């Protein structure tokens, strides 16, 4: 077999014994194989993601199947176009080897390696989120994560924060339902959550929501099943997916879009760009199908180093003015400059399948081969012209610069409708899980949280208020003042 | 209450809404509060420890109680001397938020903030280790850790490695016994593993092993109890410890030493500086007592950032020539330069309780206030004399520089001793756990592993061979050729 | 006091490594050798991407006027005295580059105010070369040494600048003798952009800041530059540190130029264009600064200071100048990298008021947190905002867009500047610019010369001769340019 | 080709940021503005702790002797052609520091051999100032600019060197005109230390390496230094890059001086003392190097190359020189920080042979691993060692120790050097040392003078004059110094 070498290519003569000053003597500083193997070892780890640290990556392909040229000019949506993908599924709060049975929303991020560049659709199984403005994301994550004093879960903290956040009511209803503990990533849907802005070749815009429909169906664990699985397997989602792909049982999802024109936004009773809302009566249209059929070759180089970011957009796809999405356009590229580095987008899993041509340079571990003296634009010696067809869409403005919440909140209606859509057994599990989680919250926050659940549906609030030992008369009088 | 501020101290006007271009417009880049909060958030995480990433830190005090001036000049051992400590307990292989029920050795690292500087005793509950030379450490960890292709446990990998490592037999016997799954950190002992060299005021040396004897007793979980605990609690060791301290029930450990003179080592049939060995008949002497009685204030600032390293030594305590230990003198300080930074030892939790006076300077995030022009030694303007009493001890040398295994291995005797010391019930649990783990290893490595167990004790090897489905006749013939 | 390791243990020998016998190899277990070398091996951090070469000093600012109608900031309250940290610098070259190299010179002032830290990061030139921060990286890459060799190559800047008529004014300032100061004490400081001051009623004013040197202005001419460089590559640092050591403390008066929001539309140029001065707006004195103390340690203080236009206090906000808007992001961003997440907690960067927020962890966090409340809002440990500190509201119209400003006036002020120079000052300018332009590609060179010609026919004509451009092509090119 | 963003998407407008209307603020969603500024903000990495100012060129080495009796290394096989990367540098000052400043000049060569990459990291000076690596951080700290002001302050290095008599020989080379070369092309290079060469029979030889310039040696005297500095702060880079552009490729012959292990105890000095040359050992030529190609990109190649004495191939090992021993640790260590754990996988650092080991992960890992076997040994995917590559064995005796070498001889070789200088060179040497020593504290100054006086009474006497030392004290201190 080929000889073991050091990183400079030199063969190693003994990989079992350190060089010592005699049989009973100390180790020498000059043993370069010892030093190099330990300095590499000592530097293998990089920071985990600040959220969604626990994840599983797989590869597959997406094939478009409809004519949506009237909605978007992006080549990924052209009927019959087959684009390779990289998908990273994940939980949200806990560290990287945390039990996959822990209750949480699950991430569903798809990197499309399109012919116009890489587009990332960074979604979750839940179609709505807990907040509507990215300025609260650091606050929200800090409240959800383990207590900073102990590294132990302490749910009284998320309910202190969330008692000030009535808009979280619908998504907390998902979290504490059995949708919070899936049986496999193959048995969950995916949603973009926000409305994205699709732009056609005439410069016209449509606001669109994306949904991945599982062709395997939806399968969740109930709290007693969660405990049985957790007893022997702390990686059941990863085992399920990797194992399925090894057996050739490739999971698939159909992609659907819901569409609104800019002039329809103001007609609704809720704000269509509020990330805490679904669009209940807008029809869905199928535009493609993705199949995930290949495992990764190396977890660290692919799954750990993949950089998913809503900022990775192609002409024809832009962010909407959803205020949650707006901060996401900054945050992922920013964190990835730190987690990976300035040259993170040049790693194999992050590279586009098209040419990159710009003046960005240098930075740590630059692996390029540059020969030109022109790293500026414009240049008449080595021009790099822009493409006028790729200019951003123009959105009309009015009012003033401002710091004010959106005007139509409707914080409790959709939560109530979701609660009522649940089977009797689903409601029972949601009520017992939410109540157990809320039981030792401070009394003031506890009765305020329970007022939101009661305003969503009196049966929901009454039952969680019994489990959590809240004060039902205070819950009802607080709920009476809440506005629809 | 005090107004929320930005990091430059300027008060914040609205922490709930980002600044937007009208009520329906996009978010502005000039919103410095949004951008600061997101950039700080985006940079919260640092690399986890390459091993022992899952850990719990607490604080307490150690009080010495014997006259060991004959063995060491170090102040921490002076009778009645009280020294504050920081202890970090941990598992080894998996990451943060991995289940604390996972089978593994457990770390027991004590930072003593002595009156002569900080001394770290970085030990484990197991008194022996799997390998005896630090050049194999990276290989050993890579074999134990989850498969690099999938991030899932795959014990065929560790047994392909350990089939070439007959010296791992005794510690794999501890690993697969119920000592591999403790009921609490308070119910385990701690050991230095290596002999350390204590030096007295005359410059004379003694080799000593350290043992923390639990005053709460030893309590382990058997396989069925592990699954039951894991079903509901993935942080059972942290909860147990933080819990006890909150209730005032402070865990204690008596510190004992085993002592051998330099001239006695050659008389043993095993090498006393072999990390795979205990010293079976050397008497123990109690030298002090440690009580852990305070939880940390902030997990990140203290438990995550603490830097435990065998290199943090004080005059009177030095590393022995144990070849595993020698590598550890280099590796912890090296990985901390990366994980923390060049200024990592100036963080609050890592600072000594005595003055630091040297020419080490600059480096990222230097928080000092230097006024001198003298950052070199020697200097006649601002001298920094050495202390001739702190010169290292002189060890006699013989032979040549070399790369060769130690001359006495005795790889199976102590492992058989350990097996035979176990109760019938403990034997059954060991055999079932080891055999289930080994069952899908490649046949050649599996029968070689079994031969090691059979040579330790024929009953051990026969029973694990039945559970693992190895070939007994091949096991017996391979064992017949093994040497004692 | 005895020499120690970083753990506080005393060192027994700091002159000899531990070796295996008199003729033998060095031992891995010598922890003093390893810890000194590992710290030494990690002393350096990335230099600033621009302005790497700099000098820092400390002093104090005292406000002297009632400007409460313009800003509610406590720093400007007449009589208020505020400690300052100032960093002066060059722009293009590395940290030990000669201080005589031709460049704009930075003048950044960190005010440790009673409302928090406010940084006024300006330059001695009152105008900049570009007017939209999206071009900053390109501009800097064209100015810096050639990426192939690390050697100055002025044809690269004129290839870029031939597309940028808006750089005419400041290029005139660069190639003049103001491009090579005699001391930092002998130069003015300008904020360049208009900032928006907001008073206690919420009213806004657009203001320009100017530091007037009370030592006067003193530039070196070309011949004096080579003379000084021959023996001194740190002449600016030497002058300032030496002057403070002798007790000759340099002082600057701070002046403001003021405009109301409804006045911006009435000029022939865009008042928020960073390549423009405000020629006819009167100046008012609002305070004075004295720099009277040298630093204790260059690295801890001068190298680690983090100056950023985003360090704002109530009463001061960015204007819509498109150059400034980019700077509000870039400084804080690069400091997260060059220093780290906890860079603003280093001694030189800390404010003199408490910091109260949920920002946490990050590399080398030196705090002492005990609370479980790292989120807002909380009813257990609230951290209320102050409604009085809400940002001002600017009226908007039109659409989101990617389009240059409409009033450019790229040559007029460039010409006024040229013609304002003495005959000798003009001669030096023409020769420095023309020598720098000489080997630019012919198309860029004659386009550059057209911008100078459009500014002032004598200017363009004299540089064309030195630089060897085609006078007739310059004149026809200039014919097609708009004032 | 069309400009793109880093994800490959085409840019529609690289001239204007996206704003909220023509007079409105910039938008956070303009991903091109943010990605360009984020990349620009992170361009710089930490400069080398020493030798930050450098120039890199490429070339080829051709072996021309049969030295298989001394080393089994393929690089030295007669007729063997190996590609090289060479980086020349100054030592003490930061990037863009004047290349005329007085220092030793680095001469590092990376040989991309058929057995792996071998780096010969040398200098023009054949000796060094100190002899144990434990003092290296102290020495560098004393040599660099004062930590309080970032200005050169030569009193600091003499405070330090007044305790270091062994630096006399190299301080003599430093203050001579060898300290200011006219080009890297006109300077020799030396490995300084003895290296251990090992042949195919396991036999060892101690060897010194010397690169003989085939352009001759060309220095600048103090008056010429000032002239070049007045106008050129990159004279060495210019000279070397320009020479190669013209086709005038510089050449160096490689020579070795050989000693057997039993010969080291014979001499009156220690042959592994880095402050010593080997005066009477003869030199044999073993090959020639020609540098004939410039780099394509300065940052990717010259800034990112990783030169380290730890990059060894079979046939070559460190000797027991105590300064060399620390260098085996420190270069790889600083490169783990300056570059990263994956720094040896960058294009310029990669070997021309396959790398096969279980080193993995780390920041920005660009590999394409498929195996699950990242440990050794393995019976599934074995990675056997080669017994012929085992390290050589050195006989030991004594005990572990912290004690200076015994045969110091700190002054004789320095005096020898001085006496070989022409009258011109002696006067230049004397004026510079004296001028640098001038404001040192009297006690250190007179002790430095004693060392010079002990090397040679005229040296001592002539430098004590310029520096204003006290000759009677110098002579009585010198009286007591031993040979
Ligand atoms: C609709 C709401 C959101 C969804 C669906 C979502 C989804 C996700 C997913 C799936 C990932 C993991 C991607 C991967 O597998 O690598 C992730 C990571 C992340 N998210 Fe979000 N998230 C949302 C809200 C936010 C917000 C509001 C912010 C901040 C402004 C944010 C910041 C981050 C960060 C910093 C990471 C780590 C990325 C990395 O290190 O590569 N997210 N998110
Ligand atoms: C007797 C054998 C060993 C014992 C008892 C042991 C114990 C420990 C413990 C208790 C910790 C965690 C300290 C904490 O809580 O921060 C640790 C971490 C670590 N150990 Fe060991 N270990 C052993 C062998 C080794 C060897 C041979 C090496 C390498 C030569 C090594 C390298 C490391 C590293 C790099 C870390 C991470 C340190 C950090 O990031 O702060 N260990 N070990």
Q: Is the shortest distance between the CB of A319 and ligand 1 below 6 Å?
A: no
Cis peptide before C377 (omega within 30 of 0): yes
A266-293 in b/e burial notation, b at 16+ Cβ within 10 A?
Answer: eebebbbbbbbbbbeebebeebbbbebb
Where residue D216 falls (left for φ over 0; alpha for ψ -120 to 50; beta otherwise) is left
* Close Cβ partners of B349 (under 8 Å, ≥ 6 residues apart): B86, B301, B302, B305, B306
Distance CA B71, CA B316 (A): 8
Q: Is the shortest distance between the CB of B125 and ligand 2 below 6 Å?
A: no
Measured between CA atoms, how close is D45 to chain C, in angstroms? 5
Distance CA D154, CA D144 (A): 9
First to last CA, chain B: 73
* Close Cβ partners of C223 (under 8 Å, ≥ 6 residues apart): none
**Of all protein residues, whose CA lies closest to atom 38 belonging to ligand 2?**
B332
* Ordered DSSP codes for D399-453: BEE----S----SHHHHHHHHTS-HHHHHHHHHHHHHHHTTS-HHHHHHHHHHHH
Domains plus CATH for chain D?
1-483 (2.40.180.10)
DSSP label of D146: P
Question: Cβ(C154)–Cβ(C440) under 8 Å?
Answer: yes
Q: Is the shortest distance between the CB of A253 and ligand 1 below 6 Å?
A: no
Length of chain B: 484
Residue B114 buriedness (CB in 10 A; 0-12 / 13-18 / 19+): buried
3-state class of D211 per DSSP? strand
* Close Cβ partners of D258 (under 8 Å, ≥ 6 residues apart): D70, D197, D205, D206, D207, D281, D284
Judged by CB atoms closer than 8 Å, whether chains meet at A43 and D11 is answered as: no
Query: Could you write out the three-class secondary structure of chain B?
Result: CCCCECCCCCECCCCCCCCEECCCCCEECCCHHHHHHHHHHCCCCCCCCCCCCCEEEEEEEEEECCCCCCCCCCHHHCCCCEEEEEEEEECCCCCCCCCCCCCCCCEEEEEEEEECEEEEEEEECCCCCCCCCHHHHHHHHHHHCCCCCCCCCCCHHHHHHHCCCHHHHHHHHHHHCHHHCECCHHHCCEECCCCEEEECCCCCEEEEEEEEEECCCCCECCHHHHHHHHHHCCCHHHHHHHHHHHCCCCCEEEEEEEEECHHHHHHCCCCCCCCCCCCCCCCEEEEEEEEEEEECCCCHHHHHCCCCCCCCCCCCEEECCCHHHHHHHHHHHHHHHHHCCCCHHHCHHHCCCCCCCCCCCCCCCCCCCCCCCCCCCCCCCCCCCCCHHHCCCCCECCCEEECCCCCCCCCCHHHHHHHHHCCHHHHHHHHHHHHHHHCCCCHHHHHHHHHHHHHHCHHHHHHHHHHHCCCHHHHHHHHHCCCC
Q: Is the shortest distance between the CB of B126 and ligand 2 below 6 Å?
A: no
- For the annotated binding site of C for heme, the residues are 331
First to last CA, chain C: 72
Residue B482 buriedness (CB in 10 A; 0-12 / 13-18 / 19+): middle
Distance CA D52, CA D165 (A): 28
DSSP label of C127: S
In 3D, which of B91, B169, B233 has the Cα closest to residue B430? B169
Q: Is the shortest distance between the CB of B344 and ligand 2 below 6 Å?
A: no
Distance CA A355, CA A375 (A): 16
In 3D, which of A26, C12, A209, D378 has the Cα closest to residue B157? D378
**Of all protein residues, whose CA lies closest to atom 9 belonging to ligand 2?**
B107
* Ordered DSSP codes for D338-403: HT-TTGGGSGGG--SS---SS----TT-------S--SSS-SSS-----GGGPPP--B--SBEE--
CB atoms within 10 A of CB C397: 14
The beta strands (E) that lie in C137-269 are given as 189-190, 195-198, 204-213, 251-259
Q: Which two tokens stand for residue D438?
A: 């001038």
Residue D479 buriedness (CB in 10 A; 0-12 / 13-18 / 19+): exposed
Tell me the technique behind this structure. X-ray
Distance CA D392, CA D403 (A): 25
| B106, B122, B140: residue to mutate for ligand 2 pocket, most atoms within 8 A of CB | B122
At residue C18's C-alpha, the angle toward residues C16 and C21, to 5°, is 105
Distance CA D373, CA A1 (A): 14
Sign of CA dihedral D422, D424, D427, D430: negative
Resolution in A: 1.8
* Close Cβ partners of B277 (under 8 Å, ≥ 6 residues apart): B128, B170, B270, B271, B410, B414
Chain D residue with the nearest C-alpha to that of A350: D7
Angle between helices C442-455 and C412-419 (to 10 degrees): 70
In 3D, which of C414, C89, C385 has the Cα closest to residue C237? C89
CB atoms within 10 A of CB C471: 14
Of D358, D379, D394, nearest to B142 by CB-CB distance is: D358
3-state class of A304 per DSSP? helix
Question: Cβ(D63)–Cβ(D80) under 8 Å?
Answer: yes
Cα dist from D34 to A356, A393, C326, D236, whole Å: 17, 18, 9, 38
> Which residues does chain D have within 8 Å of residue C30's beta carbon, measured at their own beta carbons?
134
> Which residues does chain C have within 8 Å of residue D296's beta carbon, measured at their own beta carbons?
148
Chain B residue with the nearest C-alpha to that of D368: B149
Question: Is B452 a known ligand-binding residue?
Answer: no
Helix then strand count (H, E) for chain A reads 12, 12
Distance CA A473, CA A471 (A): 6
Helix (H), strand (E) at residue C245:
helix C235-246
Length of chain C: 483
Question: Cβ(D353)–Cβ(D118) under 8 Å?
Answer: no
Residue D10 main-chain phi, psi, to 5 deg: -70, 145
Question: Cβ(A234)–Cβ(A287) under 8 Å?
Answer: no
The beta strands (E) that lie in A14-54 are given as 20-21
**DSSP H stretches of helix in C16-110:** 31-40
Q: Which two tokens stand for residue C394?
A: 């600017």
Question: Cβ(C89)–Cβ(C105) under 8 Å?
Answer: yes
Residue A387 buriedness (CB in 10 A; 0-12 / 13-18 / 19+): middle
Distance CA B365, CA C300 (A): 8
B82-98 in b/e burial notation, b at 16+ Cβ within 10 A?
Answer: ebebbbbbbbbbbbbbb
Provide long-range contacts, Cβ within 8 A and 24+ apart, for C201-204: C202/C392, C204/C261, C204/C392
Distance CA C247, CA D341 (A): 49
Q: Which residue has the tokens 């004789």?
A: D412
Distance CA B227, CA B225 (A): 5
Q: Which residue has the tokens 């994560």?
A: A145
Q: Which two tokens stand for residue D321?
A: 């020189």
Q: Which two tokens stand for residue C378?
A: 């909380």
Question: Cβ(D349)–Cβ(D305) under 8 Å?
Answer: yes
**Of all protein residues, whose CA lies closest to atom 38 belonging to ligand 1?**
A332
In 3D, which of B307, B324, B329, B57 has the Cα closest to residue B171? B324
Question: Cβ(A18)–Cβ(D126) under 8 Å?
Answer: no
Q: Is the shortest distance between the CB of A130 and ligand 1 below 6 Å?
A: no
The beta strands (E) that lie in D69-225 are given as 81-89, 106-113, 116-123, 189-190, 195-198, 204-213
Distance CA D214, CA D235 (A): 20
Q: Which two tokens stand for residue C257?
A: 């130029």
Q: Is the shortest distance between the CB of B88 and ligand 2 below 6 Å?
A: yes
Helix (H), strand (E) at residue C121:
strand C116-123
> Which residues does chain A have within 8 Å of residue C21's beta carbon, measured at their own beta carbons?
21
Helix (H), strand (E) at residue C293:
strand C283-294
Question: Cβ(C295)–Cβ(C57) under 8 Å?
Answer: yes
* Close Cβ partners of A249 (under 8 Å, ≥ 6 residues apart): none
In 3D, which of C51, C423, C90, C128 has the Cα closest to residue C229? C90
- Distance (angstroms) between ligand 2 centre and the Cα of B131 equals 13
> Which residues does chain D have within 8 Å of residue A318's beta carbon, measured at their own beta carbons?
29
In the annotation, is C123 catalytic? yes
CB atoms within 10 A of CB B476: 18
Could you tell me which chains touch chain B, where touching means 3 or more CB pairs under 8 A? A, C, D
**Catalytic residue (one of D51, D105, D193, D210):** D51
Cα dist from B291 to B81, B192, B212, whole Å: 14, 18, 11
- Distance (angstroms) between ligand 1 centre and the Cα of A332 equals 7
Q: Which residue has the tokens 């005959």?
A: C423
3-state class of C135 per DSSP? helix
Distance CA D219, CA D125 (A): 13
Task: Compute the 3-state secondary structure of chain C and give helix, strand, coil in percent, each to the nearest 5.
Answer: 35, 20, 45
Judged by CB atoms closer than 8 Å, whether chains meet at C400 and A398 is answered as: no
CB atoms within 10 A of CB A80: 7
Judged by CB atoms closer than 8 Å, whether chains meet at A369 and D347 is answered as: yes
Measured between CA atoms, how close is A51 to chain C, in angstroms? 14
Cα dist from A259 to A121, A272, A315, C481, whole Å: 17, 11, 18, 48
3-state class of C463 per DSSP? helix
Measured between CA atoms, how close is B38 to chain D, in angstroms? 13
In 3D, which of C332, C386, D32, B38 has the Cα closest to residue A134? B38
Residue C458 buriedness (CB in 10 A; 0-12 / 13-18 / 19+): middle
* Close Cβ partners of A384 (under 8 Å, ≥ 6 residues apart): A357, A358, A359, A377, A378, D1, D2, D3, D14
Residue D268 buriedness (CB in 10 A; 0-12 / 13-18 / 19+): exposed
Number of C to D CB contacts under 8 A, please give it.
284
Q: Which two tokens stand for residue D90?
A: 């100054």
- Distance (angstroms) between ligand 1 centre and the Cα of A51 equals 7
CB atoms within 10 A of CB B285: 14
Distance CA D351, CA D118 (A): 9
Distance CA C161, CA C452 (A): 12
Where residue D160 falls (left for φ over 0; alpha for ψ -120 to 50; beta otherwise) is alpha
In the annotation, is C163 catalytic? no
Distance CA B33, CA B12 (A): 7
CB atoms within 10 A of CB C245: 10
In 3D, which of D391, B410, D312, B393 has the Cα closest to residue A20? D391
**Catalytic residue (one of A94, A106, A118, A124):** A124
Question: Cβ(A256)–Cβ(A284) under 8 Å?
Answer: yes
At residue A409's C-alpha, the angle toward residues A407 and A415, to 5°, is 175
B252-267 in b/e burial notation, b at 16+ Cβ within 10 A?
Answer: bbbbbbbbbeeeebee
Distance CA C301, CA D150 (A): 12
> Which residues does chain B have within 8 Å of residue D400's beta carbon, measured at their own beta carbons?
392-395, 397
Chain A residue with the nearest C-alpha to that of C444: A380
Angle between helices C168-175 and C412-419 (to 10 degrees): 30
């Amino acid at each position: 077999t080929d000889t073991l070498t050091r990183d400079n290519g030199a063969v190693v003569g003994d990989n079992q014994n350190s060089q010592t000053a005699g049989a009973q003597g100390p180790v020498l500083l000059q043993d370069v194989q010892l030093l190099q193997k330990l300095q590499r070892f000592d530097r293998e780890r990089i920071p985990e993601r600040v959220v969604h640290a626990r994840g599983t990556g797989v590869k597959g392909e997406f094939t478009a199947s409809a004519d949506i040229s009237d909605l978007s000019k992006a080549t990924v949506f052209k009927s019959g176009e087959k684009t390779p993908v990289f998908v990273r599924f994940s939980s949200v709060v806990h560290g990287n080897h945390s039990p996959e049975t822990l209750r949480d929303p699950h991430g569903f991020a798809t990197k499309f390696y399109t012919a116009d560049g890489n587009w990332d659709l960074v979604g979750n199984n839940f179609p709505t989120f807990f907040i509507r403005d990215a300025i609260k994301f650091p606050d929200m994550v800090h409240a959800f994560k383990p207590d900073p004093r102990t590294n132990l879960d302490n749910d009284s903290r998320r309910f202190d924060f969330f008692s000030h956040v009535p808009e979280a009511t619908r998504t907390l209803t998902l979290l504490y339902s059995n949708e919070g503990t899936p049986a496999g990533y193959r048995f969950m849907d995916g949603n973009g959550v926000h409305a994205y802005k699709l732009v056609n070749a005439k410069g016209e815009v449509h606001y669109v929501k994306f949904h991945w429909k599982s062709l395997q169906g939806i399968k969740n664990l109930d709290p007693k099943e969660v405990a049985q699985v957790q007893s022997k397997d702390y990686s059941h989602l990863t085992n399920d997916l990797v194992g399925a792909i090894k057996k050739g049982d490739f999971p698939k999802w159909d992609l659907y879009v819901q569409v609104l024109k800019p002039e329809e936004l103001a007609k609704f009773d809720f704000d269509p760009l509020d990330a805490t809302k679904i669009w209940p009566d807008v029809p869905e249209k199928k535009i493609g199908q993705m199949v995930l059929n290949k495992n990764v070759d190396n977890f660290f180089q692919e799954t750990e180093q993949v950089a998913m970011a809503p900022a990775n957009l192609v002409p024809g796809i832009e962010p909407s003015e959803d205020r949650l999405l707006q901060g996401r356009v900054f945050s992922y590229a920013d964190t990835q400059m730190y987690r990976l580095g300035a040259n993170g987008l040049s790693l194999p899993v992050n590279q586009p399948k098209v040419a990159v041509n710009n003046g960005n340079q240098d930075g740590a571990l630059n692996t390029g081969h540059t020969t030109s003296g022109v790293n500026y634009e414009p240049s008449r010696l080595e021009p790099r012209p822009a493409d006028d067809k790729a200019r951003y869409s123009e959105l009309p403005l009015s009012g003033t610069t401002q710091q004010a919440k959106i005007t139509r909140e409707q914080n409790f209606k959709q939560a109530g409708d979701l609660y009522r859509s649940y089977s009797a057994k689903e409601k029972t599990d949601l009520v017992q899980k939410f109540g157990e989680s809320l039981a030792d919250t401070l009394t003031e926050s506890k009765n305020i949280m329970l007022s939101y659940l009661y305003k969503e549906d009196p049966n929901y609030g009454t039952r969680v208020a019994e489990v959590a030992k809240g004060d039902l008369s205070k819950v009802k009088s607080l709920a009476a003042s809440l506005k629809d």
